[PDB]
Design a protein around this ligand. Structure first.
Ligand SMILES: [Mg+2]
Ligand SMILES: [Mg+2]
Ligand SMILES: [Mg+2]
Lengths: 404, 49, 82, 112
C-alpha cells in the first residue's frame, strides 16, 4: 500500500478573502453560532440539554495494566492513572465544556500550557468562533487562523497546527478533519421555529382578547362625525371602565364586541417543537411537549434506546480524540511514563438507573469479581487485590474470616 | 444624543425646570458595490496557478 | 417635558424606527401623498426617510400574466449575476 | 487485531453509516513510514464510483473531487482500495444500492 493517502478529499476554499464555499465556514458563520448560543430562549436551552446529556454525567480514566506502571515520580510512587488524575484534576468540567462547545461549533479547540518551571499546567481551551482551520489538498489541517474583536474592529493572527489541538464530534465523512455545526446544519429549522413563535405572539396580541366596538347613530339615520365620537369614546373608555360599570343609552348606541377569534396556537407550538426537537435529535419530551401512545411500553423503550445510542456514539467520538490529541501528548512531553500505554477515557451514562444495576448485582453477582461489581456500582474498588479479584462478596469473605 | 449642558442656579423650594435630553439622527443609505470576473473551464484547468 | 410625539423624542421611539422601515418597504415612488396618510407623513417624518420604492421587494419580483415556466415570484436581486 | 484496529467501534459506525447512505463504503490501506500497518482509511464515498467487468467484479475505481470552481478526476486500480456493500440488487451485486435513491420519491413527498 502507501504511507500517504492516494484518494482526494473534495475540500478547497477561500484563501485570505471570504468565499461562500460550502466546505469552509467563515468568521461570520461562526459568530452566527455564537449568536444562537447567547440569544437564549427555547432553542438555546434544548442545545444546552443536548450538551448536558452527552457530557454532564462526568468521566473516569482507565489504563490497561495500570499496576505495571508503578514508578517514582517525585520521591513518591504513582501509576499512570494516578498521574493523569493529578494532571487533569477537574476533567469532568473540561469534558462538559469542550463537549458542549464541540456540539455547538464544528469543533472544540485549545492549547497545551506549561508552568514557568515547564511542567504541565492545563489544556487551556480556545474560543471556537474565533478560530478556523486551513487544510491541505490531501485533507490534514496545517494551520489555524484566528480573528478576535477589539474596540469596534478586529485583531487577526495565524498559528501552526502544532501546539493547538482540536476535537470534532460531527463529521461530513469519516475522512473529515473539520466537521459540521449542528446549528448551521439546521439553521432553516431554527428560523422556522423563531418565525412561528413571533407569528403566534403577535396573533395572541391581536386576536387572543376580545375588543369593544361601539357603533353610534341609527342605521340610515343622521351621520356622526369624529368630534361626536370623541365624546362616546370618553364614556366607554376601557382605560377608565371597571368590571361592574353599567351603561344607560338611547336606542341608537350599540355596544358590539370583537370576540377573541379562536386559533389552535398550542397545535402550532407542538408542531414547531416536534420539528425542532427531532431536527436536533432530542426526544420531543425535552421541549416540555407531550405525546400520545409514545409515553409507555416498547414505543418508550425504542426512543430512549435511540437517544442512548446517539449519546454513546458522541461519547466515544470525543473520548478517542481527547486521549489521542490531549492526554497522550501531555504524557509523552511532561511525564516519566510510556505514552503508548492503553489509556481510555470513559464518560458516564446520563440515563443509567442505579436501582436497575442493584437488581442486576443481586441476580448475577455470583459471576462477577468484586472489582467488576465495584465498577458497575460506581464505587472505588477494594484496597486488597485478592478480595477485589475474587467473585464472592467482601462481606461474605469477612464473615468466613470471622469463622476462622 | 444632544451635547452635555449645565444645571442652572435655583431658589430654595422653587420648581426645578426641564432640560431633558433631546435627539436627532444620522441617516445611512447603503450603495451596492460590485465586482466580477469569468474564467473558462479550459483556462481554469491549464493555468499553472 | 417631552411626549412621545414631541420632535426631540421621535428618534427614541421604537415605532418611529419600525414604521419608517415599513414605509420604505411599502412605497413605489418618492411621492408620499400618493401612498401614505397625512397623519403618517407627520407622525413618522416621512419627508426625511429615503422613500423612493428601491427598498420595496415588489419592485424586483417578476409577475407576468401567463407563466408556463415558474418564473413568477423570482426576485432579480437574488440572481447569480446580481 | 485489537492492537491493529484500536478504534474499531468508531470505524464500524462510520463505514456502516456510509454503506447505508451510499451504495458502498470504500477506502485505502495505509502504512507508517517504516511500512508497518497504520490504518484502514475510509474515502469520501460520494467522490468514488466503481468500474467493473463482464462478470460484474470491480476492476478500477474512478474518483471525482471538487476543487476551486470545478473538478479534478483520477483513476485507481481495484488492487489497493477496499469496499463494502450492505444493500444489494442480487447476491452477485458488487456495486450495491443507495437506500436514499431507492426511496427518493418518499423523501420528495415528505419534503414537499
Ligand atoms: Mg341627514
Ligand atoms: Mg440645564
Ligand atoms: Mg439645551
Amino acid at each position: 500500500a502507501s504511507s500517504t493517502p492516494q484518494t482526494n478529499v473534495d475540500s478547497m476554499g477561500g484563501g485570505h478573502s471570504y468565499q461562500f464555499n460550502g466546505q469552509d465556514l467563515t468568521f461570520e458563520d461562526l459568530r452566527d453560532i455564537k449568536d444562537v448560543r447567547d440569544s437564549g430562549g427555547q432553542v438555546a436551552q434544548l442545545m444546552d440539554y443536548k450538551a448536558l446529556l452527552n457530557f454532564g454525567e462526568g468521566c473516569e480514566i482507565h489504563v490497561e495494566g495500570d499496576d505495571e506502571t508503578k514508578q517514582l515520580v517525585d520521591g513518591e510512587p504513582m501509576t499512570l492513572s494516578e498521574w493523569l488524575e493529578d494532571a487533569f484534576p477537574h476533567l469532568d468540567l473540561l469534558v462538559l465544556d469542550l463537549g458542549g462547545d464541540a456540539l455547538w461549533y464544528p469543533y472544540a479547540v485549545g492549547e497545551i500550557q506549561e508552568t514557568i518551571t515547564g511542567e504541565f499546567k492545563e489544556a487551556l481551551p480556545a474560543e471556537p468562533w474565533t478560530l478556523m482551520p486551513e487544510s491541505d489538498a490531501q485533507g490534514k489541517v496545517q494551520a489555524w487562523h484566528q480573528r478576535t474583536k477589539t474596540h469596534g474592529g478586529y485583531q487577526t493572527q495565524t498559528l501552526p497546527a502544532d501546539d493547538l489541538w482540536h476535537i470534532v464530534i460531527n463529521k461530513a465523512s469519516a475522512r473529515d478533519e473539520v466537521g459540521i455545526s449542528e446549528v448551521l446544519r439546521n439553521k432553516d429549522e431554527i428560523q422556522a421555529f423563531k418565525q412561528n413563535e413571533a407569528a403566534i405572539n403577535q396573533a395572541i396580541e391581536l386576536h387572543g382578547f376580545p375588543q369593544r366596538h361601539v357603533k353610534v347613530g341609527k342605521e340610515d339615520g343622521a351621520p356622526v362625525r369624529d368630534n361626536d365620537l370623541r365624546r362616546v369614546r370618553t364614556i366607554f373608555d376601557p382605560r377608565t371602565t371597571d368590571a361592574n360599570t353599567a351603561y344607560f343609552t338611547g336606542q341608537d348606541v350599540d355596544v358590539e364586541t370583537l370576540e377573541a377569534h379562536n386559533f389552535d396556537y398550542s397545535a402550532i407550538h407542538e408542531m414547531d417543537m416536534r420539528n425542532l426537537t427531532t431536527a436536533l435529535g432530542l426526544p420531543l419530551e425535552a421541549g416540555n411537549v407531550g405525546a400520545d401512545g409514545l409515553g409507555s411500553g416498547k414505543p418508550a423503550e425504542l426512543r430512549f434506546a435511540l437517544l442512548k445510542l446517539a449519546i454513546k456514539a458522541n461519547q466515544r467520538s470525543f473520548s478517542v480524540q481527547f486521549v489521542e490529541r490531549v492526554m497522550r501528548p501531555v504524557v509523552r512531553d511532561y511525564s516519566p511514563f510510556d505514552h503508548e500505554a492503553d489509556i481510555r477515557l470513559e464518560i458516564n451514562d446520563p440515563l443509567e438507573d442505579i436501582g436497575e444495576v442493584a437488581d442486576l448485582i443481586q441476580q448475577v453477582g455470583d459471576y462477577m469479581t468484586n472489582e467488576q461489581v465495584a465498577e458497575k456500582l460506581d464505587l472505588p474498588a477494594p484496597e486488597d487485590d485478592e478480595v477485589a479479584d475474587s467473585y464472592r462478596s467482601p462481606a461474605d469473605m469477612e464473615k468466613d474470616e470471622a469463622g476462622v | 444624543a444632544s451635547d452635555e449642558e449645565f444645571a442652572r442656579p435655583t431658589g430654595q423650594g422653587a420648581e426645578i425646570r426641564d432640560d431633558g435630553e433631546t435627539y436627532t439622527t444620522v441617516a445611512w443609505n447603503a450603495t451596492k458595490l460590485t465586482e466580477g470576473s469569468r474564467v473558462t473551464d479550459e483556462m481554469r484547468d491549464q493555468a499553472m496557478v | 417635558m417631552q411626549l412621545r410625539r414631541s420632535p426631540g423624542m421621535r428618534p427614541m421611539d421604537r415605532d418611529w424606527h419600525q414604521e419608517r422601515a415599513r414605509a420604505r418597504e411599502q412605497a413605489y415612488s418618492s411621492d408620499l401623498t400618493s401612498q401614505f396618510s397625512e397623519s403618517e407623513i407627520v407622525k413618522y417624518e416621512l419627508d426625511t426617510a429615503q422613500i423612493d420604492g428601491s427598498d420595496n421587494p415588489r419592485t424586483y419580483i417578476w409577475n407576468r400574466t401567463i407563466d408556463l415556466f415558474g418564473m413568477n415570484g423570482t426576485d432579480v436581486r437574488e440572481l447569480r449575476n446580481r
